[PDB]
Symmetry: D2
Subunit: 491 residues, 4 copies
């Protein structure tokens, strides 16, 4: 309700110290605070955020607060929260937080629901804006509205919320069961809750590829109920966070969760997109022999041109040492694959959720034995072969689960985009007239802003930009102040 749910408020001092050190490099957020803390462009805005509550995220939240917004926050992953970062926010009254490291899936959805719940002075209401990372906040909202419509239609709790199985007879994921449990609970309390939030919702800014995919599907089906900004596809996000962020954070995660030396090992990177590219650079950097799997012939060729062998998993599963999933897809590592792996092979996911690796199938395999090697590291032994595989973070984000995620510099680039997106959505609220238009679309930030995010971080690294002369600008057909590239330029 009014008060936060965190692990330990006494960790606040450590969180505040890390925030100040992190700000040395997060110049984008620091500049936005300096430029807008007086004018308060977000004054009066109620912002709910679902995003890994790390030290870096604390600076984002602080920035939103300095710009005048009231804030409620939760994490987008059960293992990613840094307790000292959460405590710092609560200690300084920057936001109302519902997050802690090592949440149960049930608590995850309760926290998200709590973060979405705001008290109207003199009754309940929702947020004005949403910062989402993976689409869970956006999902609970849309599924909540659907549940309420189905509830009024038949005057009973929808049967899909009570069943433990899906349309095809398979067990629902824990995440779906726990969300449904929350939705059912809210239908019993107030069946106009979700639709009531739509009146004041002016938008959502989505951080990731996976979340953007869900938004684009809803958009094309006429089911998106609020404006949305795709932050992921800003050049200063997808080409930095996804690539250079993972280059460092994958290693940090592997070094903490995997005791073995990476040098000389055959490490399979499944997927060679923006994340995979970064993972491969990092792994090579410390002597690993990277093997790539890929479905896209263009991405496969890119891997080959960087000197990496490109194979189908079946041909290298028995001899490779470590497997890293970076596909954003489902079942890229099956139970059948894991049974063919060699003794003490390590398996990790840097992609999304926990379905890239079939963790459910592994945990529920008949007669399988499991032991905790350390926090968030489990060794599974098959009964017939007596061979074992070691899974990091129960198949969830290894960089945020076994380590602290991306470092401040690149997160400042991603989060500067987030703040700019929130400001865009808020400044455009007058155009959101639900007595007229209710089905909305997804847009991206302009190239001008994209270049601006980069400008804001040049001094951190002592970068000196060259300035075009009037003649040069005319010659390459651009303004001296940009933008410098066409909209289709790939960097």
């Amino acid at each position: 309700k009014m008060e936060s749910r965190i692990k330990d408020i006494s960790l606040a001092e450590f969180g505040l110290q890390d925030m100040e050190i992190a700000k040395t490099d997060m110049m984008g957020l620091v500049e936005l605070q300096r430029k807008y803390r007086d004018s308060k462009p977000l004054k009066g805005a109620r912002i709910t955020g679902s995003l890994h509550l790390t030290i870096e995220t604390s600076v984002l939240v602080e920035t939103l607060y300095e710009l005048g917004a009231e804030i409620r926050w939760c994490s987008c992953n059960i293992y990613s929260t840094q307790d000292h970062a959460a405590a710092a926010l609560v200690k300084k009254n920057i936001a109302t937080v519902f997050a802690w490291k090592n949440e149960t899936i049930e608590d995850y959805w309760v926290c998200l629901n709590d973060a979405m719940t705001w008290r109207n002075p003199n009754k309940i209401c929702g947020p004005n804006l949403i910062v989402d990372d993976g689409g869970d906040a956006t999902l609970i909202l849309h599924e909540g509205v659907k549940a309420e419509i189905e509830y009024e239609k038949y005057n009973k709790i929808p049967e899909y919320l009570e069943t433990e199985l899906d349309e095809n007879g398979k067990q629902l994921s824990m995440d779906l069961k726990c969300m449904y449990k929350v939705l059912k609970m809210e239908l019993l309390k107030n069946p106009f809750r979700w639709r009531g939030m739509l009146k004041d919702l002016y938008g959502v800014s989505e951080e990731t590829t996976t979340g953007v995919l869900r938004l684009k599907i809803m958009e094309s089906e006429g089911k998106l109920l609020l404006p949305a900004i795709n932050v992921n596809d800003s050049v200063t996000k997808s080409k930095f966070d996804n690539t250079y962020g993972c280059r460092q954070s994958l290693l940090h995660g592997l070094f903490n969760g995997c005791i073995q030396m990476l040098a000389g090992k055959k490490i399979v990177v499944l997927g060679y997109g923006e994340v995979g590219k970064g993972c491969a650079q990092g792994l090579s950097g410390v002597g690993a022999r990277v093997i790539v799997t890929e479905i896209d012939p263009i991405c496969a060729l890119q891997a080959s041109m960087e000197g990496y062998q490109v194979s189908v998993l079946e041909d290298v599963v028995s001899e490779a040492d470590i497997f890293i999933t970076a596909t954003g897809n489902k079942d890229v590592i099956t139970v059948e694959h894991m049974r063919k792996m060699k003794e003490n092979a390590y398996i990790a996911n840097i992609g999304h959720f926990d379905d890239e690796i079939d963790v459910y199938g592994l945990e529920n395999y008949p007669g399988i034995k499991v032991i905790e090697v350390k926090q968030n590291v489990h060794k599974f032994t098959f009964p017939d072969t007596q061979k074992s595989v070691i899974l990091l973070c129960k198949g969830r984000l290894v960089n945020l689960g076994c380590a602290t995620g991306h470092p401040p510099l690149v997160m400042s680039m991603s989060f500067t985009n987030q703040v700019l997106a929130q400001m865009d959505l808020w400044k455009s609220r007058e155009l959101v007239d639900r007595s007229k238009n209710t089905r909305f679309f997804v847009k991206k930030l302009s190239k001008e802003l994209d270049e601006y995010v980069a400008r804001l971080h040049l001094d951190v690294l002592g970068i000196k930009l060259t300035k075009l002369t009037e003649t040069q600008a005319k010659y390459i057909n651009v303004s001296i102040n940009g933008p410098y590239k066409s909209e289709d330029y790939r960097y």
Copy 2:
């Protein structure tokens, strides 16, 4: 009717290199195997302005096997490989007007000759090509400037004054390339003042290979001055993200090793521009121990360089201490005479970008009291009279990879050229939609992602790459077809 090349006896070496090159150019080999019977380009007259290398010979061969009649010239005075040209002439694949080390005057005469076709209806009459393969926009330029010249000629009933003067609108000397093109245009106005406009009737399009040429097309498009449909081949993912990057990673080094005697390891090498070309150049240079310093105007590109461990500086701060300078900007005057006077003894300067304007070669060659000596073929050392310091320029400021070496290797050129053939087939198959009886405006388009992915598929076996195939469930999960395309149109790879 007959070709102008250096030496037909080099044909055998050219044919041997073509066959070895085809081992890796599987895209072109597959197109030949798939379309040599159906002849999708049957009857098409294709004029090409593109570095006549062994790789280009396979492109030309592919177009010929698909049924086209061909006339070709190079797009750069130093890039032609004489054995490649001879091979084409020897086998009657095409009529060639190209040789290594052309004068600028001969360059434009060759281009004009390549654009000139004898009409098959009336053999005593002249006509133009149906399609154009252009690399830098010179073929597209002479066409548009030719039409302008003819309109101005009819208006005043005399040779336009801009074609006779040696100066431009601002009083500065015209570039040699402009003077020599103007000289050709003047000559053609005297022979036939309806030549260029007469070619428009049968022109169905141009497929442009490079960034620089695409820029010229986009300017014409926005001013309503583009006189034919165009396909931007450069911006295909299988071209800009491979040829420009990985091609230059190898070909820049080849060029530097041939033109620059010095060791690259430990040297401070400035790469001006960190776009698709600059990125590749930097990887290659680092790969052999150089300490790469990047200059850039785009803050996003500058940050990318920094994230790969490269120092990013303004030229003024590193010009006196750096050892080698490589221009990869596609811009003008990035290395001025004032910059070269501050450089250290025997600093090397090269351009991998475009034309010869990135470095102010004109200003250097015409500097008062400057001394020049030929170090070797296409390598000149300039000594300033006051400081007595020297700088060494590779290829008179023209493409170092194609001037001092043989350009990109077959594999990546097959990817670029597979796109070219597909573009030519697209333009030819769409002929009926080109209606000039109206005041139609032409635009620039790109090939589809389906074809872009196809180009990549065609080259996977060369390198033993094994693609994974999506299951029906996976395809639904990431919202794509099992056969693609696999990425949104805005995806940057």
Copy 3:
């Protein structure tokens, strides 16, 4: 005495699990256990070890035990011990351990002294020393030699030597904490038994030294005729110096920096002071994650090598104000002074991967007038100067960052180093009869043969699926080597 001093025996199960996972890659130690567990080549040997008590070290200790030795162990660094690794050893009765993470300097020397103290098997009421020593940095070797010196000076004047009671050195400056605490132990032992150290010499047959720094100390003693036992330089085996030092640090430096330094390494100017075997590895790792590495070096050959790998080579004074992170890998003293740290930019990070804590002048920093310090996290402190109000962040109080903020080198390379250690211990033990102390024998430092050096490498090839080519009889004759090696001359540098 009889029982171990560790933090928590209940952590044993986690330690045993990590040991088994680590053994998947430590094939050298696994092979030695399989080959010698029955014959017990070290049967009856009393071995004292001073070496970072990590999981990897636990497998070394286990190997020595399986080969028949009785063992007492302590760590060679106050922060490097992994408590679960120590517990595993105590739980299985493999050794008597005196080690825990985050020891005080006083406790460090007490633990070392305890590890060196053995109950004589003939008369249980009497004390004796070890037969062999595994040393990492030379502290075990130092306390022995300084102990003997102290005892000789004690008999000469029949009183406690004045250098052991004073808190100052010969020049009037404060003694290092490590010296004060060792002296405190030596004084205590002179009062208990002034023939303790010389009494250990009768049964000491050798020491196998793991590091460059320790080897330097041995070579100095050797040249002055002051080395009191045979010694084996393990560091200079090719399978140690060219792997552990280089590839080990390439991974463990990063692990340490990622845990202690919250910042992104990409695009940062990171100064690596020293470009030896450690520096080379550090630079590869840092570059691998996008850092712009700047090297400082005193050796013109090493400086050129750095330049050939694309690194700028500068003197610290010219880059101290603009660099972001500083890593000392010199094995030298005062490479980063207080004056240097005052010129650094806000929140610059400083770390040491070299030795002890004197590469960076931590004493001068901590004792600077009016300096403020705050704990950022475990083993990470931010120091703020009073005049400029600028701060610097020091990792592990200037001690080994890879072992202090992380878990040190991974198993594979430590197996290579430790396979050399076991082979050295076996060499020293098998040669005991030749150590005749009834004369004024002078001891020297030797290295393991190339045959054994190649053997260590052979033992680890299968781990990584490496397939060796075998020479034909003609090829072997052509390059003038035996089909079974060794394949290189003694001066070959790899």
Copy 4:
């Protein structure tokens, strides 16, 4: 022969221009010229050199000349000579040259013999030999020793030895072309003057050998008591083996491949046979341009090093059918056999960066029954087998690809190697009085000191803007070295 045998004297101007540009980076040679051109330490010395006559070598020759030596030179490889470099030397009277690009093997040995032949300054109508030899591969050293053996066998039976007339060896197999052509020269010299070779020994004071292969031959002669003159192993200087061999090949292999192989290296599986100093460099370069390097190796230590740098290590048999390009860097024989080449895929490229032409079995390939060969370009031949109709493309007939298809290593690293050469020549010349042949004196192979090795590196620091740090008196004492070095022990591997 008084006059030189070169291709074209008119190329002299281009050679002189390249020499001056090259000297910008060859600071070692430039410094030796500046320091010794007045004192002439080599005054009166007759120096014969057998070493790739490149622009870099021209600066070496110029340096020797400036130091006072009279010079005769030939190349050590039939394809390596740069004609403009040779012309420059002849044009300026720096030396008498017997070299040109694309020599026949017969002409190679005639040129070497001519370079070894000097007109005696006492009696101009009589012959004598050189005082000193600069050798690269050991051919100059070989013809001398085989010449002496031939003369001894000639006097013993008073007839031409039968091994010099036969075209076969002791086992009935064809002698290599290099042996036949050398024997043809030796036979010719026995008929003219059977005391020629032994007569040269009176005035021979030494040979400085540039390469690993040549050093091996010297070490064999040394151990058999058959070395007839003092020798200096230049290869094993740190400033040679750790730079020239590694960083030189990193650039020159690529240059050679780019000129001889039309294909793209990126994404190709390129097998590097041998991972020594040359192989290491080759692998870095190849990776640098996107190749996927696969290493073969016989030394388990070198194999592990490759693995730690991320390279697959395999036996050739397991990858020969699927790899694209093969580079031999072993210094061994028959590492690529005819059976291997028959299993290779269509248009696979094969090259050697090692030595001579026996790493790849070129003889077996060229003489294979029914094989077809075509010249693709200068020094590039495609061989097609008759049964499979598959082809393989061989660069430079299996000889040094970097010097055959390209111009060899660049000036900076050659200055480091050649500064060592000049210092070696000065050492041998200054020691001439100690060569007393009135006894049955046995000669040995020695190396230059670490002091000089460090000096070579110091001389090249300014070229690259390297700033060395200087030790304080306290630091120097702490690490036990002199402020001015040497900084490392003799066994240090860098």
